[PDB]
Design a protein around this nucleic acid. Structure first.
Ligand SMILES: [Mg+2]
Ligand SMILES: [Mg+2]
Ligand SMILES: [Mg+2]
Ligand SMILES: [Mg+2]
Ligand SMILES: [Mg+2]
Ligand SMILES: [Mg+2]
Ligand SMILES: [Mg+2]
Ligand SMILES: [Mg+2]
Ligand SMILES: [Mg+2]
Ligand SMILES: [Mg+2]
Ligand SMILES: [Mg+2]
Ligand SMILES: [Mg+2]
Ligand SMILES: [Mg+2]
Ligand SMILES: [Mg+2]
Ligand SMILES: [Mg+2]
Lengths: 144, 97, 179, 149, 51, 122, 206, 32
RNA sequence: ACCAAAGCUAGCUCAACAUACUAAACAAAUACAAAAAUACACCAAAAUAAAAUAAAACAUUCACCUAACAUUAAAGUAUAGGAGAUAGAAAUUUUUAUCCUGACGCUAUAGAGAUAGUACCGUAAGGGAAAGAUGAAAGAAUAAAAUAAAAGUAAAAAAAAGCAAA
């Protein structure tokens, strides 16, 4: 819906730049269909700031999910992925809450991707990666 | 000729404010008041203008006679010049003679 | 004895160099004359050093270490001054009873302004003095006109300052009618 | 002392004494090469040669051999947004020369700490690493990398 | 005959006014994640098994 | 069209124009045309020994300030002349004619530093 | 240092002598005057550090500590309450650190809260019998303390250590004064044992 | 609202300060 | 689509009152070539206002025109005047306090010249400008928001023939 006000109650200051930034001139259609394995709590951590006496509870919830994501380009032409495929995801989702704070919101802090994580589905468009830009007197050198 | 693009703040004048509600109250002070004070007395204004009237020349001439010695230099000088001008104009210029 | 223009070498490259509060007047009223006389030099040396560091900071395009010291020191010296002056001005009020340490007179100059004319020390008395004799303290008659103008001009300014303030009150009263 | 009245001197008067001196002084690094004999100060406009020599010797115990002075004119040329001229204030410069063969040298007041410079290079490397972390993936082609799928 | 342009915009990071801040920046959150749980490498094959 | 606004200074005129920057004259022109300095007109700095004494350019922060009472001619009269005057009136030895024992000075022209015409700079 | 501001000036929460300010309003800026409800300094019931309730905005019915007041524009700052988000670190490839920042409040949108029941209240200045001036609640009929707050220096007097050039409390509070009728010059010259004979010849003043 | 008190002509004898220079010289006369 | 366009403030105007009327600020320096602590002197002063203009010219004359006495009348009367233009009284009369102060005044080509007697122009006396617009916050500039309307241009060169239209 691109509603940022509610998005500032839910997600944290570190997350918001990330999930909003790139996507603001595009259209997103995201749907939740199934949760295959019920959400698991992996771990909990606290950071004790001796300066502020401030504690931030950080809860990592591992979750396995079925989601439909379609990103459209600002001209309305499809960019990322289909709207009909209920694709299976595995995400390790970090949450955070300020404690000493009387208003005590539970928020979505970060998203951790594992080193072995399955390569994300391929892009639609073709992409080109240029070789190093050379000045006149600089000769090219090829690694093997 | 560009005209202002935004509606001004609509100004609300209540006509029942004190000054507007009490307007013209003592104007009949002479008649109903067993004549003692003439309505002139009600007039708040410049000293030379209270309960009196006249064309710009007469006005100026009168201002000078009454307050002319309490005036600032620049203003007295200006007044004299205005008087001289008005004199010359009224007396020697016009269509009708 | 040239190093008193610089901080202890232990301080040189450091960002924050901390320091005490400047002297209040009150703490100084308690000290004797001799000790104030000394404290003046202790404060002097330090003010000099601080100014040196200041300019040298500008030279190196770097921010000055804990700039605030320079303020504090100044105040102290300044404060010290205020104290010593008191004890003189009190004292002479006792002895002579003149409120001003410099002889002076209320005079009216060429331009008709009423001026306070400070006196000057001369080896010869005033009627024998060429240069002083050719000043005029008095106004000629024409000046009287200008004087009037001055007044009127002044009066105007005050007059329309007043009217301004008055106006500002009305505006606010219709903007914030919490009365 | 400055800004103050001095008592008129006539013949056979008491020695004039200043108990709390008004002046102040900057020791400044020279803009041009100078012999090691020579120290250079910026002084107040009203301080004479003799004044400064006495000042140095009495307050600071420095053996002054010789003192010269000049007055530096500050530029009046720079303009305000109003096109009014700004004046960088004029000042007096004092070259002094030390007596006993004493050599001076202007001390370096800002030696850099190598641990703070190494921490600066490491924080610059960490910042460059964060800006390389945030930098878009060439092969994604501009698809936002937040979504798992 | 003498008038010039204005408005050349610039961003200057300078530590001195950044320190002189009278109301230090209040954070709702911390940017990093302290300890990152590193999951089993066979976590795909243990997911099809419930218990 | 010259320069009206900029202040008049020795840097501006001809050779013949020499106007000091406001330092005070230390002497006079003598016989040979050479200049003579009078040792009396040159300010003599009076500097105390600082070494053996304890005071510093700054003060401890937890050290208290105080209620601010500007010294008045009156308070100074009470701390000095009032004890002595009361002591010698209670003893009946008070002499309204000569107050000089209490520190009052009838006239300023005798002493080195005079208060009213103000003989000393600082 | 005292920086003199032009007669017509706007207050942007940025310290008037700072680069944020010189960049916001350069040498020649004269903007439209913002009408400000006049408040005598003796009618001003809001200081820094006291817990207050917000009557307006998206965050309302909440309570927070007052960090900074701006008196010229009649403003309070409740830390991390009235809020809008802003990026701080910036370079061409990197937009860093989105930070919640505080938008100031008029004093009409914030009421002072009395400690006991944590309700908002109408504060009124009262003089008690001890010669003391305290804030008294209209609704609850109690007195409200004043918010003792740290200071701009970040230096707490209780924890402090004297450096080389600091004078100790002892030597500073010590009274050396002997209130006698000589001047500084006579005192010092007598103490240093400087002996002067000659006196000044007559000088004429005019 | 309620109106101001009506303007009335005081019937008491009225004597101007003979010593006030701002007073008109017609109100200082025998005739007055 | 450019160039542009829109704000409502800064302040002002005219009166009232009012105490009384050369503001503010003075540490030093200021009447040497003002802002330069210090040497036998001099110092100071007044003389009718004139003319442009009206008289259809101009010659006597020509209100007001840097001198306190106001107001209602007497009265534009008595008088004075190349008896022309015009000028013009008096005797004698009248005048009740103090509070209710403000605005059918201006809103940036207006209202003060005024953001300033500054810039700039004159050797000097002197003359004398123009200029402002975001928002609660810019300690909200990958920035967010409502005109896109003057002439001038661009988007888009022209095609026999003629006051350009009907
Ligand atoms: Mg030379
Ligand atoms: Mg010129
Ligand atoms: Mg010259
Ligand atoms: Mg030359
Ligand atoms: Mg010589
Ligand atoms: Mg004619
Ligand atoms: Mg004609
Ligand atoms: Mg003719
Ligand atoms: Mg005439
Ligand atoms: Mg005749
Ligand atoms: Mg005729
Ligand atoms: Mg204008
Ligand atoms: Mg104009
Ligand atoms: Mg057009
Ligand atoms: Mg045709």
């Amino acid at each position: 819906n691109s509603d940022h006000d509610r998005l500032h109650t839910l997600v944290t200051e570190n997350c918001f730049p990330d999930m909003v930034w790139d996507i603001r001139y595009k259209t997103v259609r995201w749907s939740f269909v199934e949760s295959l394995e019920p959400p698991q709590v992996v771990q909990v951590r606290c950071s004790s700031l001796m300066n502020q006496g401030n504690i931030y509870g950080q809860v990592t919830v591992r979750m396995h999910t079925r989601q439909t994501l379609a990103i459209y380009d600002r001209f309305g032409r499809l960019m990322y992925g289909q709207e009909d495929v209920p694709r299976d995801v595995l995400e390790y989702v970090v949450f955070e809450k300020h404690l000493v704070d009387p208003y005590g919101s539970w928020r979505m802090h970060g998203k951790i991707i594992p080193p072995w994580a399955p390569p994300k589905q391929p892009i639609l468009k073709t992409v080109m990666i240029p070789g190093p830009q050379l000045k006149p007197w600089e000769e090219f050198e090829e690694p093997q | 000729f560009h005209v202002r693009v935004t509606l001004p703040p609509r100004k609300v004048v209540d006509r029942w404010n004190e000054k507007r509600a009490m307007f013209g109250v003592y104007d009949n002070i002479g008649i109903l008041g067993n004549f003692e004070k003439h309505p002139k007395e009600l007039i708040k204004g410049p000293i030379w203008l209270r309960g009196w009237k006249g064309n710009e020349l007469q006005r100026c001439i009168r201002k000078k006679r009454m307050v002319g010695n309490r005036m600032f230099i620049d203003d007295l000088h200006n007044l004299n010049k205005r008087i001289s001008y008005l004199y010359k104009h009224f007396n020697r210029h016009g269509k009708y003679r | 004895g040239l190093e008193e223009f610089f901080d202890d070498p232990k301080n040189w490259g450091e960002e924050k160099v901390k320091s005490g509060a400047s002297w209040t007047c009150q703490q100084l009223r308690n000290k004797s004359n001799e000790d104030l006389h000394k404290l003046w030099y202790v404060l002097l040396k330090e003010r000099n050093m601080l100014l040196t560091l200041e300019q040298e900071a500008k030279r190196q395009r770097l921010p000055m270490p804990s700039p605030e010291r320079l303020e504090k020191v100044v105040d102290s010296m300044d404060a010290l001054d205020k104290v010593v002056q008191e004890r003189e001005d009190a004292l002479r009020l006792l002895q002579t009873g003149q409120e001003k340490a410099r002889p002076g007179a209320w005079r009216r100059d060429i331009f008709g302004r009423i001026i306070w004319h400070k006196f000057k020390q001369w080896p010869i008395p005033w009627y024998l003095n060429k240069k002083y004799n050719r000043k005029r303290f008095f106004a000629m008659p024409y000046v009287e006109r200008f004087v009037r103008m001055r007044i009127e001009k002044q009066a105007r300014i005050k007059a329309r300052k007043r009217s301004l303030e008055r106006k500002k009150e009305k505006f606010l009263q219709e903007k914030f009618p919490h009365l | 002392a400055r800004n103050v009245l001095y008592p008129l001197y006539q013949l056979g008067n008491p020695q004039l004494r200043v108990f709390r001196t008004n002046f102040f002084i900057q020791l400044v690094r020279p803009g041009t090469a100078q012999p090691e004999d020579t120290v250079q100060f910026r002084i107040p406009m009203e301080m004479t040669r003799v004044d400064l020599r006495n000042y140095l010797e009495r307050i600071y115990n420095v053996p002054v051999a010789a003192v010269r002075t000049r007055v530096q004119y500050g530029s009046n040329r720079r303009r305000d947004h109003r096109n009014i001229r700004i004046k960088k204030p004029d000042y007096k410069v004092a070259y002094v020369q030390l007596a006993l063969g004493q050599t001076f040298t202007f001390p370096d007041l800002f030696p850099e700490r190598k641990g703070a410079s190494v921490d600066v290079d490491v924080r610059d490397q960490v910042l460059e690493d964060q800006r390389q972390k945030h930098s878009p993936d060439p092969r994604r082609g501009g698809v936002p990398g937040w979504f798992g799928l | 005959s003498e008038k010039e342009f204005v408005e050349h915009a610039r961003k200057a990071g300078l530590v001195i006014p950044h320190e002189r801040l009278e109301r230090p920046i209040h954070l709702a959150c911390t940017a990093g994640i302290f300890d990152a749980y590193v999951p089993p490498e066979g976590d795909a094959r243990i997911s099809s098994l419930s218990k | 069209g010259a320069d009206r606004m900029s202040k008049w200074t020795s840097k501006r005129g001809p050779r013949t124009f020499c106007k000091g920057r406001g330092a005070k004259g230390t002497g006079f022109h003598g016989r040979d045309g050479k200049f003579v300095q009078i040792k009396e007109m040159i300010p003599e700095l009076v500097v105390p020994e600082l070494a053996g004494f304890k005071l510093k350019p700054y003060v401890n922060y937890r050290a208290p300030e105080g209620t601010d009472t500007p010294l008045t001619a009156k308070q100074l009269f009470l701390e000095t002349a009032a004890p002595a005057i009361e002591k010698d009136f209670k003893a009946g030895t008070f002499d309204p004619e000569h107050l000089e024992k209490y520190g009052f000075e009838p006239t300023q022209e005798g002493k080195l530093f005079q208060l009213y015409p103000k003989n000393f700079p600082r | 240092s005292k920086v003199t501001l032009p007669p017509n000036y706007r207050y942007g929460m940025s310290r008037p002598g700072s680069l944020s300010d010189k960049r916001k309003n350069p040498p020649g800026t004269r903007r439209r005057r913002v009408p400000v409800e006049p408040i005598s300094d003796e009618d001003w019931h809001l200081f820094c550090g006291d817990k207050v309730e917000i009557l307006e905005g998206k965050d309302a019915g909440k309570q927070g500590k007052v960090v900074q007041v701006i008196r010229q524009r009649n403003w309070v700052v409740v830390e991390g309450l009235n809020t809008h988000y802003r990026y701080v670190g910036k370079t061409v490839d990197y937009r860093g650190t989105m930070i919640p920042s505080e938008a100031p409040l008029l004093h009409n949108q914030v009421k002072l809260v009395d400690p006991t029941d944590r309700k908002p209240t109408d504060v009124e200045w009262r003089f008690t019998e001890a010669g003391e001036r305290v804030r008294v609640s209209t609704r609850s009929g109690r007195i409200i303390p004043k918010p003792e707050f740290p200071r701009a220096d970040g230096i707490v007097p209780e924890t402090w250590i004297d450096g080389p050039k600091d004078t100790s409390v002892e030597d500073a509070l010590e009274k050396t004064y002997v209130p006698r009728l000589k001047t500084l010059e006579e005192e010092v010259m007598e103490a240093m044992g400087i002996q002067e004979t000659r006196r000044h010849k007559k000088v004429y003043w005019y | 609202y309620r109106a101001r008190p009506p303007p009335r002509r005081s019937q008491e004898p009225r004597w101007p300060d003979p010593d006030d220079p701002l007073t008109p010289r017609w109100q200082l006369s025998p005739r007055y």
